[PDB]
Design an enzyme around this catalytic site. Sequence first.
Site, PDB file in Angstrom:
ATOM      1  N   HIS A 460       0.828  -1.203   0.000  1.00  0.00           N
ATOM      2  CA  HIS A 460       0.000   0.000   0.000  1.00  0.00           C
ATOM      3  C   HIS A 460       0.864   1.254   0.000  1.00  0.00           C
ATOM      4  O   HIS A 460       0.717   2.125  -0.866  1.00  0.00           O
ATOM      5  CB  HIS A 460      -0.941  -0.008   1.209  1.00  0.00           C
ATOM      6  CG  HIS A 460      -1.758   1.241   1.356  1.00  0.00           C
ATOM      7  ND1 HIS A 460      -3.089   1.306   1.003  1.00  0.00           N
ATOM      8  CD2 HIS A 460      -1.435   2.471   1.825  1.00  0.00           C
ATOM      9  CE1 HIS A 460      -3.550   2.521   1.246  1.00  0.00           C
ATOM     10  NE2 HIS A 460      -2.564   3.250   1.739  1.00  0.00           N
ATOM     11  N   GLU A 461       1.781   1.359   0.963  1.00  0.00           N
ATOM     12  CA  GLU A 461       2.592   2.565   1.074  1.00  0.00           C
ATOM     13  C   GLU A 461       3.541   2.721  -0.105  1.00  0.00           C
ATOM     14  O   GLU A 461       3.863   3.850  -0.491  1.00  0.00           O
ATOM     15  CB  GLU A 461       3.367   2.557   2.391  1.00  0.00           C
ATOM     16  CG  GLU A 461       2.478   2.442   3.619  1.00  0.00           C
ATOM     17  CD  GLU A 461       1.439   3.548   3.700  1.00  0.00           C
ATOM     18  OE1 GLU A 461       1.707   4.664   3.207  1.00  0.00           O
ATOM     19  OE2 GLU A 461       0.349   3.298   4.256  1.00  0.00           O
ATOM     20  N   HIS A 464       1.847   4.686  -2.832  1.00  0.00           N
ATOM     21  CA  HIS A 464       1.986   6.128  -2.657  1.00  0.00           C
ATOM     22  C   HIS A 464       3.357   6.605  -3.120  1.00  0.00           C
ATOM     23  O   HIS A 464       3.481   7.684  -3.711  1.00  0.00           O
ATOM     24  CB  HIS A 464       1.766   6.511  -1.192  1.00  0.00           C
ATOM     25  CG  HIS A 464       0.345   6.395  -0.730  1.00  0.00           C
ATOM     26  ND1 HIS A 464      -0.702   7.022  -1.372  1.00  0.00           N
ATOM     27  CD2 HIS A 464      -0.197   5.750   0.330  1.00  0.00           C
ATOM     28  CE1 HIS A 464      -1.829   6.755  -0.736  1.00  0.00           C
ATOM     29  NE2 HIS A 464      -1.551   5.984   0.301  1.00  0.00           N
ATOM     30  N   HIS A 467       3.433   6.808  -6.832  1.00  0.00           N
ATOM     31  CA  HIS A 467       2.676   7.973  -7.276  1.00  0.00           C
ATOM     32  C   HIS A 467       3.490   9.251  -7.109  1.00  0.00           C
ATOM     33  O   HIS A 467       3.452  10.136  -7.971  1.00  0.00           O
ATOM     34  CB  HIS A 467       1.361   8.061  -6.501  1.00  0.00           C
ATOM     35  CG  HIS A 467       0.407   9.085  -7.034  1.00  0.00           C
ATOM     36  ND1 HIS A 467      -0.704   9.501  -6.333  1.00  0.00           N
ATOM     37  CD2 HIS A 467       0.393   9.770  -8.202  1.00  0.00           C
ATOM     38  CE1 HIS A 467      -1.358  10.402  -7.043  1.00  0.00           C
ATOM     39  NE2 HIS A 467      -0.714  10.583  -8.182  1.00  0.00           N
ATOM     40  N   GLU A 489      -5.941   7.634  -2.360  1.00  0.00           N
ATOM     41  CA  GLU A 489      -5.807   6.248  -1.936  1.00  0.00           C
ATOM     42  C   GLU A 489      -6.108   5.256  -3.051  1.00  0.00           C
ATOM     43  O   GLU A 489      -6.233   4.057  -2.781  1.00  0.00           O
ATOM     44  CB  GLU A 489      -6.712   5.978  -0.732  1.00  0.00           C
ATOM     45  CG  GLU A 489      -6.245   6.663   0.541  1.00  0.00           C
ATOM     46  CD  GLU A 489      -4.903   6.139   1.022  1.00  0.00           C
ATOM     47  OE1 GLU A 489      -4.569   4.981   0.724  1.00  0.00           O
ATOM     48  OE2 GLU A 489      -4.169   6.877   1.697  1.00  0.00           O
ATOM     49  N   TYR A 599     -11.385   6.434   1.672  1.00  0.00           N
ATOM     50  CA  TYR A 599     -10.760   5.119   1.576  1.00  0.00           C
ATOM     51  C   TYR A 599     -11.681   4.127   0.875  1.00  0.00           C
ATOM     52  O   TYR A 599     -11.287   3.487  -0.108  1.00  0.00           O
ATOM     53  CB  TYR A 599     -10.376   4.615   2.967  1.00  0.00           C
ATOM     54  CG  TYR A 599      -9.194   5.335   3.574  1.00  0.00           C
ATOM     55  CD1 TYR A 599      -7.894   4.944   3.279  1.00  0.00           C
ATOM     56  CD2 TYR A 599      -9.375   6.404   4.442  1.00  0.00           C
ATOM     57  CE1 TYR A 599      -6.809   5.597   3.829  1.00  0.00           C
ATOM     58  CE2 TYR A 599      -8.293   7.064   4.998  1.00  0.00           C
ATOM     59  CZ  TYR A 599      -7.013   6.655   4.687  1.00  0.00           C
ATOM     60  OH  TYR A 599      -5.931   7.306   5.236  1.00  0.00           O
TER      61      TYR A 599
HETATM   62 ZN   LIG Z   1      -2.856   5.307   1.757  1.00  0.00          ZN
END
Ligand SMILES: [Zn+2]
Lengths: 665, 6
Positions: A460-461, A464, A467, A489, A599
């Site tokens: 998940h992180e 980011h 991105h 998210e 989310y």
């Molecule tokens: Zn996130």
Amino acid sequence: SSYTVAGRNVLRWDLSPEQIKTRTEELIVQTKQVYDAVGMLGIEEVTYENCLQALADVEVKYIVERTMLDFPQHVSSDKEVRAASTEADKRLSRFDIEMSMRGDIFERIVHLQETCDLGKIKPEARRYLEKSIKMGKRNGLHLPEQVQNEIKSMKKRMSELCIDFNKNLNEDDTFLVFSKAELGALPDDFIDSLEKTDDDKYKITLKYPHYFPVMKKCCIPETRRRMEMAFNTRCKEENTIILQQLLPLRTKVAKLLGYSTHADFVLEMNTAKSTSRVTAFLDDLSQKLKPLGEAEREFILNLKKKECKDRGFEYDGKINAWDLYYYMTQTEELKYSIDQEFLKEYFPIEVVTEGLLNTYQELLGLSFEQMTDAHVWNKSVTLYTVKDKATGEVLGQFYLDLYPREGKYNHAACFGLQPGCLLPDGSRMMAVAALVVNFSQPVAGRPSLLRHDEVRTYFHEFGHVMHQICAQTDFARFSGTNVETDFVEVPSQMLENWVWDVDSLRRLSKHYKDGSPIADDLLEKLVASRLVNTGLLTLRQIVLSKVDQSLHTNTSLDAASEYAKYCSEILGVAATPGTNMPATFGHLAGGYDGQYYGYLWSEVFSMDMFYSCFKKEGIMNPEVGMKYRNLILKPGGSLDGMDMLHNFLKREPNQKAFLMSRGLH
Amino acid sequence: YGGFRR
Ligand SMILES: [Zn+2]
Ligand SMILES: [Cl-]
């Protein structure tokens, strides 16, 4: 140079408390001189170079220098450096409000858009003007003078309240003491890592690597109750005072700006547009999950009744807050044959890191390389350089801060340190990101073994991070993850789907002892267990989303009473009397105010892209991966979130893939 | 901050 790396990371991490305070004053003086020079220009004298270009040049230089000042409070091991960083954040946040509410700047930007030929400038420059004008109206710069002064003073007040809200939670050191018998069913590798007391007991802190393993494995009900009480009362006194002041201020500011509620004020800047859309989205999803929550709660009560009978405990006939994670863990073991403590043996952190980097080097067409003797803020931090695989263009760098320590940010997030925008001289600034998590420590003579949920957090992180690195814009305010809050998210939750694929999990796993892969049957059961406890897990997220909407919609409400209301009405698990979960809700002060629904709102978009594009023609397809980078990640905030989804899907998004992955509809 | 739901 766009193909070099040396000199493009201007970030220093060896600043003393005195230098942080000195650089803060210097940054404010030098930045205000730019705004003062633009404000002194005549209205009929402003051009693209003396106004728009002058402001865009100072925005990128300010935010980079600001990063070196407000980031140490999250990662530095020196508490004096963290305190000086927090004071710098307070002082620079008030300065941001002063500059944002300059009427002379607002007039000259409005006059620039009216006189300039919008066709002869880049479309992102057009977006810079209309966003800047829209941000000025959202600050009341089109309103009379005395109401601007009221908005400014209340904005400065809310700034310090939000900073103090998270500062109290980040620096909390509450702990409890338990004996070995009171920590029953906990594994020895967890017990042997706790501080011993003078009476041969153990110290357990309220941090995540301590709280969750106790709430999920400890078979002593009183131990789980004492932990859940202390965890949901952190900063109860001081943060309730902050919420009792912050929430009325947000309403009072939204009224002066012409909005009915603060939720309406922030919803205009999100893809959901309206609060009535958020209510219908949450309520319809809550009704679809209602049968699942009823079946899951009935199974949990049966597990609790049998365990109380087998262990000789008292049975109160209800699912308390301190029972939810414990019997959710049992549901995963019994219904899906998943033992997290055994499965983590196949996920040593170095194998997971290798497979994570290799998965997205191949998918996104990137090249990762670790830097040696890197300048970092902590010894355990590593640095990597990201290049484009085809051209060799140095896109950016990211740091990996994976292990917990005293004073470190205790949750899991990604920080944008340098934007991938253009510099005043024409060159492009190298993007910089930081992945900050708190994974399991290496204990018992073994490497760091990550559970599957920790691997999913790692993915998940890292979404980011990708991105932040792949984003390339002209202006700093549109770079990185500066997209809609209910859209930021999407890239992170999108990459979580790769921890639920059999072949992808086989490339991420290798036993720490003999190097053998995970068995085929166990690997199939892990993927099939994606929807375990999904009824109550998602309902709890709806509870948080409804409470976040309610606290920013209705006036004069008790935060604890509203949270307990939705816990009983939606989740079916009552909130413990005496606790105050909203007092610990850090999202309410970390930019997610009135926007926590984002989310679940983003998950609909990520599931639609993964099922309709990746899962149909190979999830490792380089063509689909490059299309995802160029259309979703590369534009950054230079385009609306819905527009980027349209370019990638060639249609409108829908909930068909989202509901199908949830076993609904 | 830029990362993880509660
Ligand atoms: Zn996130
Ligand atoms: Cl003013």
